[PDB]
Write a protein that binds this DNA or RNA. Structure first.
Lengths: 62, 62
DNA sequence: GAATTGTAAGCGCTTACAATTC
DNA sequence: GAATTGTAAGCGCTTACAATTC
């Protein structure tokens, strides 16, 4: 089973998963317009990230 | 940073990550010899799996 | 021929650097 | 030219099915 994800809102927003992950990661390098671009996307679909995927993927910097 | 992993013990054991993940997953489909094969590998290197990687990858069946 | 092992892809996410934009 | 977005790879793990083994 695959619920809503960054791929979905990224698709919605147009962008990639790299853009959404930024917003999901507190944008920063994502432009204000884009931050809203994906948040709006997240909102419609009801985007909920997974703490594990974030933990695992976030371990790249470790 | 990448510590000991299934890749390591899989390398050691002379198998794949699929074999080790089985043993890591309580072998079952892994032959007794192999179970020992990888456990021995796990032992030398001091293999410690990651609960997240297991949680994430374990969500495949979900 | 059935069980076990391998690719090989993905479970969802993260990111970085270069090209385009200004 | 610098910032932002895209591929694109992988952070560690899981698995399933076919060929070889018996």
């Amino acid at each position: 089973m695959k619920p809503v994800t960054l791929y979905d809102v990224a698709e919605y927003a147009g962008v990639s998963v790299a853009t959404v992950s930024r917003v999901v990661n507190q944008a920063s390098h994502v432009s204000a317009k884009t931050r809203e671009k994906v948040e709006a996307a997240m909102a419609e679909l009801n985007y909920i990230p997974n703490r594990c995927a974030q933990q695992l993927a976030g371990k790249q910097s470790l």
